[PDB]
Enzyme design. Structure first.
Site, PDB file in Angstrom:
ATOM      1  CG  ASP A  49      -1.846   1.166   1.295  1.00 35.82           C
ATOM      2  OD1 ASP A  49      -2.603   1.359   0.327  1.00 35.82           O
ATOM      3  OD2 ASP A  49      -1.838   1.893   2.312  1.00 35.82           O
TER       4      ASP A  49
ATOM      5  CG  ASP B  39      -2.029   7.636  -0.003  1.00 35.86           C
ATOM      6  OD1 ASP B  39      -1.228   8.591   0.083  1.00 35.86           O
ATOM      7  OD2 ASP B  39      -2.668   7.372  -1.042  1.00 35.86           O
TER       8      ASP B  39
HETATM    9 MG   LIG Z   1      -3.383   3.361   3.132  1.00 38.21          MG
END
Ligand SMILES: [Mg+2]
Length: 181
Positions: free
Chosen positions: A21, A23
């Site tokens: 991932d 963010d």
């Molecule tokens: Mg995230």
């Protein structure tokens, strides 16, 4: 549906595929000015160019370089490429990411952008997902390597502390034997 990833390179055939991932996992971005940002890039939204301040999570360079050596790494974010691509370009200096997947590759399931791992085209006994949002992997709770959401704690050591555990996982035959399913 077409799988999200192409055939694995010969060298990656027996390596675990790790969905990573962006963010709050590797970085933290914002529209409001932040002092000492690592990246400050332009992103067009509705025809207007906005400056996006990006802060890198402590040890992300060491993390990415090492992960890239151990697994078939894949960036999978729920954000748009116009933002994630440039950030990934600045982050990955080792070609750790074998592929990059954005918003459109997620499945909008019950109001959330879910990352369906069965969609990758990899053996689930050989797949891991590193995402700060458990909602992202609702279909594959046992393929996840829990990770804390990061915002600006320069004392954070999660990425550094996770390498030992990933090292361990890179040596097992089935991740479920460890993660338990
Ligand atoms: Mg995230």
């Amino acid at each position: 549906m077409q799988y999200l990833l192409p055939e694995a390179k010969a060298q990656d055939s027996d390596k675990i595929c790790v969905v990573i991932d962006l963010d709050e996992t590797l970085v933290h971005s914002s529209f409001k000015p932040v002092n000492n940002a690592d990246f400050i890039i332009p992103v067009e939204i509705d025809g207007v160019v906005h400056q996006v301040y990006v802060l890198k999570r402590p040890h992300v360079d060491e993390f990415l370089q090492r992960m890239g050596e151990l697994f078939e790494c894949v960036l999978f974010t729920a954000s748009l490429a116009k933002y994630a691509d440039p950030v990934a370009d600045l982050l990955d200096k080792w070609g750790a990411f074998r592929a990059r997947l954005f918003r459109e590759s997620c499945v909008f399931h019950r109001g959330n952008y879910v990352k369906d791992l069965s969609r990758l085209g990899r053996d689930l006994r050989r797949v891991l997902i590193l995402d700060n949002s458990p909602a992202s992997y609702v279909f594959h709770p046992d393929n996840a390597v829990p990770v804390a959401s990061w915002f600006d704690n320069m004392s954070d050591t999660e990425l550094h502390d996770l390498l030992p555990f990933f090292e361990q996982l890179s040596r097992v035959d089935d991740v479920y034997s460890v993660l338990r399913q």
